[PDB]
Amino acid sequence: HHQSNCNSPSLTFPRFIGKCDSCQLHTKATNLVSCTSCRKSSLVYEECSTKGCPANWHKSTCQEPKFNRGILSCYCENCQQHTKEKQTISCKNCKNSATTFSHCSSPECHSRWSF
Length: 115
Ligand SMILES: [Zn+2]
Ligand SMILES: [Zn+2]
Ligand SMILES: [Zn+2]
Ligand SMILES: [Zn+2]
Hints:
The protein is mainly beta. The chain has one domain. The chain is 3% helix and 37% strand. The chain is built from 1 helix and 8 strands; from the N terminus they run ββββββββα. It is elongated and about 50 Å long. GO terms for molecular function: metal ion binding. Keywords: Membrane, Metal-binding, Transmembrane, Transmembrane helix, Zinc. Zn(2+) 1 binds at residues 6, 35, 38, 110.
């Protein structure tokens, strides 16, 4: 609590591949939001690329993942700024969606990000 907030949010959206806990293959993609200024991060969404894995959010009948990504802009309930984003992940072919976690980029909120 001796710490101080970051007053220059500068956001990037890293993606790392790792081991999926379900199928145990090296196919789990962890997508984040990160501030390069303070180097804190918040999980946005996870997905496994293994066909048929419960951690893969596509229908069983999906022929081809057609990835598209959406952005919604909201007012934040913690800092009252217009700095909140709800991202959407869905497939144009199969119509399923991945679970997503929102984030707020304000100095007040993004400084409390953890990962
Ligand atoms: Zn998997
Ligand atoms: Zn920062
Ligand atoms: Zn906020
Ligand atoms: Zn699909």
